[model samples]
Target: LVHVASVEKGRSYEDFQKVYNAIALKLREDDEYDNYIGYGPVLVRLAWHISGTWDKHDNTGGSYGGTYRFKKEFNDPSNAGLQNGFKFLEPIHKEFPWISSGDLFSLGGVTAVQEMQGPKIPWRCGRVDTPEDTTPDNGRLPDADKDAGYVRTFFQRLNMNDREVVALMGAHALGKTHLKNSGYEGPGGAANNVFTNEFYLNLLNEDWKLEKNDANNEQWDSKSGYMMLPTDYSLIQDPKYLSIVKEYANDQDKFFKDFSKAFEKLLEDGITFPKDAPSPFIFKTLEEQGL
Candidate 1:
């Protein structure tokens, strides 16, 4: 008979619930960034980028390592502007220095999604910190200048299919492109701070015009002052991606359901969970508790 040992003992739901409260509290406190938009969206993006580095074949890079704390991963050109998200989490990290970097970073994503009226992403807590050498090289993250085929192929490296790719890109609806950050500017939808299907709606409904931002990059602009990166607009331009885009735009319930599934998978990439592991956690929102 063969025997295999489990990884580190994971944190309990109760303990993680406490960590959730701490992160939630800090989110409430930090509301001055990106024009009072709060740190919620970018935190979600950071979590995505961190986990997105996984290559399914080798399992070398992913949320399992929590390597973004290292300078090399943090300075990745594709990760420009994410320093703000790190700064936002600095205080909570100080309060709970014992938590693994992988755990803290993934929890930041969980907190941001739940707080912003998205789905309850069930989180697990056993990722141990690895050495700086484990940090993935830059260019592992998606390029903002790419097209739909490039997006699909890039995500496939992480084992994501078309639907997952579409759902993940829906995140664009939450945060704006910063000229200083990505050499692009403007919000993707009217409500950048709130989680919604507006990214899809805008993609399908808006009569967008191609224009150059102050940075001189071409972007799709709408009458409502929202902007979409060419890569974002490419979703609607491609028939397959466009179909899902329209589905999410027309159906909020479907979008939430799919987004939750895909987002959780993104966070869990390259990690193994035991059968006894707890199901995904649906956290209570600050508004639901009247906080």
Candidate 2:
């Protein structure tokens, strides 16, 4: 099950850095959506949604296929708001036509995270373009209305354990769930645009109650115009997950470190890279080089 790297011709770290810069610059430019929350959060979501379809058992439906560009995957109900993310990357893809769809989508997430002041996500290339027939069927992604047990069980298919699940869920701090897209509404916190530990903090500190949204779906609502899906509230309800939630809430740096690792794993799941493949590429954050 080893996946050999089809290294792009004449492409090096610098070439991918250029692609990263393109995505980063566009992330900086697109500041008008969701009341100026910017495109960073949605970009992260898009990347997660695309990669989250992985099934570790057979190594299918992962980012390695690059099938998300096809009509079937694009039209998935779970991908409602992600069109904005895809459209945002369209121009960048045109600029860097050499990069594959999977590479561009995942790298967009990496760039958004780093530029938004999160951790550096180590990424790699070599996700070649796959045909539309290879795209995963709908319903592989998680459902927002489910409980903690469902959340944990669903992630098990992707080989994500409790720690990785909690670490990855920490990403909710970056964006809000739209009612139109997910039948849930509102930002997870005040700093919804920037990556932070606020999601965990809000989960622990907020006074939440289960109520049906305007769309008749049950969700946890807070007094401050915030909402959390059933899956999000699950972390606090479960003791084991609650402990990790508190740990991340108490220490931002630790969360960042864990998130960096888990996110890399999530993006790379279901791919079997050969032992001789080059090391994962850790791109420089915009602030690190004063970009």
Candidate 3:
């Protein structure tokens, strides 16, 4: 059960940087997806979904195995709209063909966040592909319809504490949930493509109305055309979570720094890196590279 960090043979920061560049370029070129919402959000979701299956209890699942490539994991009901993210990465995979599935999938998320002006997430390589049987069972991802208590308990399996959970939840601001995909709908804020503390701001500021959608699922809807899942709304409903949510809402830099650390930790959960492993690589954004 020990998965050591093994750098892909001869692959260095430059090699993965090329892959990052390809993903970023394609993110810019593919503007038609999701009704011009672009692929950035879905790519981030894809990365999360792929890595979210980890369980600290038994060390099962996580990004290490890259089992999402298997039919069982890909067809998981929870991963409904993520196929688009996979399709988007197909060409990049074809071109590189050497990066492990886990690395590519997780790196897609890092690239999406950085390109969208989120944070500098340092990432390590070496998530070797494991057998299909190794994929965790379906239903590992957290449910969107639950309350703050449920949210807390669910993330506990992933070993995330209050601050980490609150920070990771900020990602909800990046993408809208389609009713067909997740029985939820609407963007969380105006800048759905850019990364910001808007999720926390909107959660606290919106005068939300509780209503059911066409899917007959209850959600909090605001007059601003934004929506929040019960899980998202729970952040403000619970006293402990309320403090962190408000803190993020008032401080953008704090959210970015905290999110960077939490996200990198999320993607690296189950793997064990030896003391001799190379330092995590921080890929430059397209703007940073002047692309």
TM-scores of all models? 0.93, 0.97, 0.99
Q: Write the per-residue lDDT of candidate 1 for residues 100-176, one digit (tens) a residue.
A: 88888988999998888887777766677888987888877777666888988888898889888898888888978
Q: Candidate 1, which segments miss by more than 4 Å at Cα?
A: 1-10, 287-291
Query: Tens-digit lDDT track for model 2 on 172-213?
Result: 988788879878777888888788889999999999989997
Q: Give the candidate order by descending lDDT.
A: 3, 2, 1
Residue 148 of candidate 2: its Cα lDDT? 89
Off by over 4 Å in 3: none
Order of quality (TM-score):
3, 2, 1
The Cα error of candidate 3 at residue 202, in Å, is: 0.8
Which candidate number maximizes lDDT? 3
- What TM-score number comes out for model 3? 0.99
TM-score of 2: 0.97
RMSD of 2: 1.2
Scored by lDDT, model 2 comes in at 0.87
* Model 2 ranges off by over 4 Å: none
Candidate 3 displacement at residue 214 in angstroms: 0.2
Query: Which prediction has more favorable TM-score, 1 or 3?
Result: 3
